Design a protein around this ligand. Structure first.
Ligand SMILES: Nc1ncnc2[nH]cnc12
Lengths: 273, 284, 285
């Protein structure tokens, strides 16, 4: 792992800038099986991680540059999860690279378990807040010397999930007839990689959590630290079992396609400087 | 220290298999109250940890733990006399390795005891709490024993913990206690792990109780996670060695000495119980 | 890195300090929020930069090395830590623990600490004082307890109890002193929960912690307290409410570190007077 300090992050950024002339305004991270939720990318340039010195490596991932709905984007195909053993610096670096490349808004998707009992398989839950269990317990991604070039020692997490972006996302869903699928709620991070027990799920639900997953929050924290606005959404891929105690099942990719359309239509309506 | 991967785990298993002809069907981790069970193994072969190359080392004030092979109630067992607590600073791999070795040796069922504080107000000192579920506080906060590359040889990347405390074993254990006249001491409950090694404050105990926890301890969940990961069935019991203090204006404070005493006074009954459970475990 | 807080290393540090001063501290003080002035109040003193103590941990206050200050306060001998060690900075357990263990070897019997905290309890007002009567050590419950590792038997037992961690007699005295000196209305007692940090708590996190029965939240203190209790040092700790936690995600109010600092500095003279007046009333031989 290389330290995600300004000098290391600049070297990686400068290197990418030799490989593409596209200056992204929007960063997109697609979650576990949510790829292509960003690949109507027009006039694209594809940069494999292996091509970028000091950029983290997947256990084949790509950085994809291009235009979506008239706007310049960079899409991370392949994310870094704390349960895999990646360091704080490894996970922070891509987001800080995004900042140096010009990203102003980060759009994140993930798959999550539905804790809230009103949730259905296939629902979208826009994150309006989070509970960073690892961070409260001394594994916050910002532990260590503060990189001052990027942000302040004690970032506030007020309006972490930009309310104006959430409003827009909801309006876009409604306008395109899938508003009934969209909720807003609190995402809690389980460091993982075990799925949550019923007692764990009950505790988390009672803590005020709506969905649970193993990712996203660390990226959000780094984004907010360096002043990137954040939009994040969970796809509810399963309903959490709350108490201890064999059919033909379809597992299609329609929701993935829907989410892709959703992100494209949001980007279409984002403000542009 | 030594990675709990297939190569290293097989090397250890093979060393052990050179030292005994006993192929264990049941593994037992001796925690609080199981001291006499360990010493009552029939036709036992004792293998000190120090004698097993690459097997993690742990001592009780200097004396190495042992693997003990033999029979209990006519079934082949391996008993771990000497466990590995995370509060001692042992690595994820060090704690996982013995369990994965048990898997390769042939273990199908893991039985474990521990000492716990009683949060649930109905519990009495010396009660037995069969774990029916757990809350793995270190695991939720990025100190899960499986963090790191998954060892595919042993199990899947994201293990489900749905029926982690096998419902059939729990049923049997209750039945045996009931049949033998001590059903009144047996409960089932949710165990929450405190990394430790501090005892819980009253504010911590109040929070844990209100989270839905019945007992709190500093061990066991990591082993259970590794066991479930590699498909070993689990039976675990907490011995209530302290009644959790929930009021800060109290002068009663937990001490490991009385914890040891409770373990000592209940060891005979717990041994009887485990022996009688093992006798009735399915498939013999 | 780095230096183990075991008896050998702690003895070396203490013996070095003892070559610099003959003052035998009975009270140790960790300057947190509101105690910025305390160093200046200590009389007949010697100031020892951390940089001048071999194998002592290093940290900066303002733009200079932290200091260990020895002298007299309210007629009692004290050692003051000017510059503290926060886990969110990346310091090790041994680093945080060593100074407390050094205090023990120097003769310290009582540790007084202040810190800045967010007010979760809804009856709290900005600038209030919340004496800690108990805590919830989230990092500790989640396997980041400062004592994780081999137990150092010279200092304490493997499984410390945290009963009466916040000495009830010191808490009683502190309340009495505030009452007598006309600021009893600023003083509460409560449960402190540690957020590892360095992020301020989200509204959802604040709501969770409040419902867990926490009154204030901060990023320090508990690890030092655990080390003090382990080695038998009596503890008095107070949170200055430097921000009122935002529980509502649709609120425009937010914690601001400049304001946190201002709130702490504003209360500093009163906090210091309070500590000085508690020390004056402590029993002594
Ligand atoms: N229920 C769940 N818990 C944690 N991570 C998840 N990812 C998808 N579903 C999940």
């Amino acid at each position: 792992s290389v330290t995600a300090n300004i000098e290391n992050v600049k070297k990686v950024a400068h290197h990418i800038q030799k490989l593409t002339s596209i200056v992204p305004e929007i960063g997109i991270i697609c979650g576990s099986g949510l790829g292509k939720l960003a690949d109507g990318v027009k006039d694209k340039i594809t940069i494999p991680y292996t091509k970028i010195p000091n950029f983290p490596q997947t256990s084949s991932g790509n950085l994809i540059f291009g235009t979506l709905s008239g706007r310049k984007v960079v899409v991370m195909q392949g994310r870094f999860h704390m349960y895999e053993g990646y360091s704080n610096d490894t996970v922070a670096l891509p987001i800080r690279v995004m900042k140096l490349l010009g990203v102003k808004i980060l759009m994140v998707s993930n798959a999550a378990g539905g804790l809230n009992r009103s949730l259905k398989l296939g629902d979208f839950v826009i994150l309006k807040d989070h509970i960073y269990l690892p961070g409260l317990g001394l594994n916050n991604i910002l532990v260590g010397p503060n990189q001052e070039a990027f942000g302040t020692r004690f970032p506030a997490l007020s309006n972490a999930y930009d309310r104006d972006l959430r409003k827009l996302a909801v309006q876009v869903a409604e306008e395109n007839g899938f508003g009934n699928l969209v909720h807003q709620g609190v995402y809690v991070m389980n460091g993982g990689p075990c799925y949550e027990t019923p007692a764990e799920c009950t505790m988390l639900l009672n803590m005020g959590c709506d969905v649970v997953g193993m990712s996203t929050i660390p990226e959000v924290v780094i984004a907010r630290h360096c002043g990137i606005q954040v939009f994040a959404v969970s796809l509810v891929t399963n309903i959490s079992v709350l108490d201890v105690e064999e059919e033909v099942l379809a597992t299609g990719a329609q929701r993935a396609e829907l989410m892709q359309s959703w992100f494209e239509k949001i980007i279409e309506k984002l403000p542009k400087d």
